[PDB]
Design a protein around this ligand. Structure first.
Ligand code: NAI
Ligand code: NAI
Ligand code: B7F
Ligand code: B7F
Ligand code: ZN
Ligand code: ZN
Ligand code: ZN
Ligand code: ZN
Lengths: 374, 374
């Protein structure tokens, strides 16, 4: 009924930094060859979307942000083979072209077709499917989920179980998969280990879930907002520490608590200082520290390389190291089989039109994930 | 016959930074409980010893430096069980106590009894076995091999094969094992990989040996001294580049040569800028970079954590990640079985009393390893 036609629909457009989203009418072009137009069902509010508003994460403006979502295929362009109209889907902010040297590497997931390194804010063909006020509007990470309809490249969508609950599994589109994979795949957390997780938002709680799944003995949650601790303990933190309660810097506290440093630390905030602290608190000879947080654009940290010379490993990852199009349908199948939980991450549900209240809930410290329903 | 007595002998004392070593008459105390007195047979001149002279590496002065050596046990203190008089030994600048959290960990080698992290320049008991005209002389990394005789803690010595040639296997006490293990144990270089090695001294040549042993298809040597390239190619470098030949940064050159980044990079110089260049030149999604070089004391590097967030792994190690007392004998056994060569590292052989000529050869760029013989 809409196939082959321009859709007029509502989207949350960001015209300028540090301004509220504008809910207004946009035009969504029909999909071209190897593109997929999706009716959005649910989208989460991830701190990275807030980083676009704050200018922490630089992408071309004006933009339709949003990258953690689930919906139903409205129509496919010529040549699409991996999804059909009416399929349930999760957009992939990290693509999986399956052809590039990274997609073919056993341990790589940062596909060379990504729009993260050198953001253009377009479809793969360098154009936009969105018009607003007669102007072209940029895409975000090849997803743009803060719209009733979006168009993505085939390499940026995965078909998921026909019976999945989209108002939950949208979190597999970013925050859950990222934290979980950061522990089980990137860190490769071991049975009986001691973990330190810096930041207890949706991504940090997911990291804790992965640390518990891996059989960690101790999981120490770290956050300056003690209101985060209860939920962190429910999903497996054995202890929580607030840096503001100690006279000593928290890497010293954690080193003592762990009898000379943790096996695995995670930075799940996005600050240069906590990236160095998290590295410092892992054991000097065999500790591993994983950066998950997104730091302010173009800013360098300063560190003493003697932290690494002693034996520490420092690494980072996008999307928990998961090859996105292979992994997302398996993660949904595992969720359906109750292998992990998503409800502990969901604190608030709002309609899409209340997106600005959703960003307020995050910025105040009150929410973990708000799910917007269309 | 000298057992239980003071030995008067010659040692090279460094009284002050940026001076020549001074050949002095010293007194060497007999070994106390769990100590081993060694008659030196050969010691290598490592750039780390030069770092003490230049002030790159801070350790209490005055000092007997030297840490890359082999000798024969002259006597043992009370309770020594792992060597006897007459045994061939290699002193271990990284100890293996076998009782600390690190020694018990499968990966870790940076034993908590080390004198590297917060150098005291003493025996384990906090005293010196060396006097020069009534003045105590500091130890270096619990080895002090620039002496006819030294005393080490039992956890800082390994018994090796009675038939081993000490004028070659002294290199297993630091430079060979550090470079070889950095490739084979720390990086875990893979078959068919591309490697880049920054610094083509004795330790960087040993990194090349390890990369070739691991079956790397491409091994790119990087040095500003093009006279190092011939020997690098002899031990397995497929290509060499001199950053001074190029109008653009060598990380860009290496990224284009490797069609988007190397699999494994090694910093084997000791400069902050080459540590960041080496990380940058490894592939952004799955590349691994190992720091081996010792940089100037208390200096921090500056880097963009986006280099790690994409997927890179950054690590460092001491002594190639080898658990020292377990590994040094097996490395000597493997040398005796022709598993690897040490002669390519040895460019000069001098008697001990020509130590300053040995350091002049290193500083001029002529030498790789000078072995000092007794
Ligand atoms: N690498 C990747 O693929 C991904 C990265 N991210 C990033 O991960 C980070 C976390 O995302 P969310 O969990 O959605 O964010 P969030 O904003 O819900 O949670 C961050 C937590 O950090 C705490 N915090 C702030 N300053 C702190 C400090 N100094 N010390 C300790 N805790 C502090 C806050 O109280 C908060 O609970 C963000 O930077 C986001 O951009 C998000 C997902 C994917
Ligand atoms: N982590 C560890 O356990 C160990 C660390 N080391 C350290 O490893 C490093 C190398 O030691 P050696 O091989 O004995 O030293 P070396 O001085 O023989 O070799 C260093 C090489 O770096 C090259 N070089 C200097 N500046 C350069 C630049 N800007 N760009 C490219 N090349 C440059 C030199 O021309 C030289 O060939 C030193 O810092 C040393 O202290 C040594 C052994 C053990
Ligand atoms: O939240 C996802 C994420 F990886 F952080 C991102 F949004 F893709 C990033 F990296 F911020 F661009
Ligand atoms: O060359 C040995 C070495 F590991 F580099 C050292 F000397 F111990 C260090 F690290 F320099 F202190
Ligand atoms: Zn996100
Ligand atoms: Zn790809
Ligand atoms: Zn130990
Ligand atoms: Zn050395």
């Amino acid at each position: 009924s809409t196939a082959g036609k321009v859709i007029k629909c509502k989207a949350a457009v960001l015209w300028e930094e540090k301004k509220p989203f504008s809910i207004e009418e946009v035009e969504v072009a029909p999909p071209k060859a190897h593109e997929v137009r999706i009716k959005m069902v649910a989208t989460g509010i991830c701190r990275s979307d807030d980083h676009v508003v704050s200018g922490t994460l630089v992408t071309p403006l004006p933009v339709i942000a949003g990258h953690e979502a689930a919906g139903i295929v409205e129509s496919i362009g010529e040549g699409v083979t991996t999804v059909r109209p009416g399929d349930k889907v999760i957009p992939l902010f990290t693509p999986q072209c399956g052809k590039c040297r990274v997609c073919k590497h056993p341990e790589g997931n940062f596909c060379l077709k990504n729009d993260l390194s050198m953001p253009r804010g377009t479809m793969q063909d360098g154009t936009s499917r969105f018009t607003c006020r007669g102007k072209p509007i940029h895409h975000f990470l090849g997803t743009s989920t803060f719209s009733q309809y979006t168009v993505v490249d085939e390499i940026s969508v995965a078909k998921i179980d026909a019976a999945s609950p989209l108002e939950k599994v949208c979190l597999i589109g970013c925050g859950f998969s990222t934290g979980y994979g950061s522990a089980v795949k990137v860190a490769k957390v071991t049975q009986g280990s001691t973990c330190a997780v810096f930041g207890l938002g949706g991504v940090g709680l997911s990291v804790i879930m992965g640390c518990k799944a891996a059989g960690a003995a101790r999981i120490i949650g770290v956050d300056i907002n003690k209101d985060k601790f209860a939920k962190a303990k429910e999903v497996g933190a054995t202890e929580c520490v607030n840096p503001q309660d100690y006279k000593k810097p928290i890497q010293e506290v954690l080193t003592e608590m762990s009898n000379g440093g943790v096996d695995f630390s995670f930075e799940v905030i996005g600050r240069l200082d906590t990236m160095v602290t998290a590295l410092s608190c892992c054991q000097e000879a065999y500790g591993v520290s994983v950066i998950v947080g997104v730091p302010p654009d173009s800013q360098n940290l300063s560190m003493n390389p003697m932290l690494l010379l002693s034996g520490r490993t420092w690494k980072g990852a996008i999307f928990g190291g998961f090859k996105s199009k292979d992994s997302v349908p398996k993660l949904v199948a595992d969720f359906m089989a109750k292998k992990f939980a998503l409800d502990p991450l969901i604190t608030h549900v709002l309609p899409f039109e209340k997106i600005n209240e959703g960003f307020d809930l995050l910025r105040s410290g009150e929410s973990i994930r708000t799910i917007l329903t269309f």
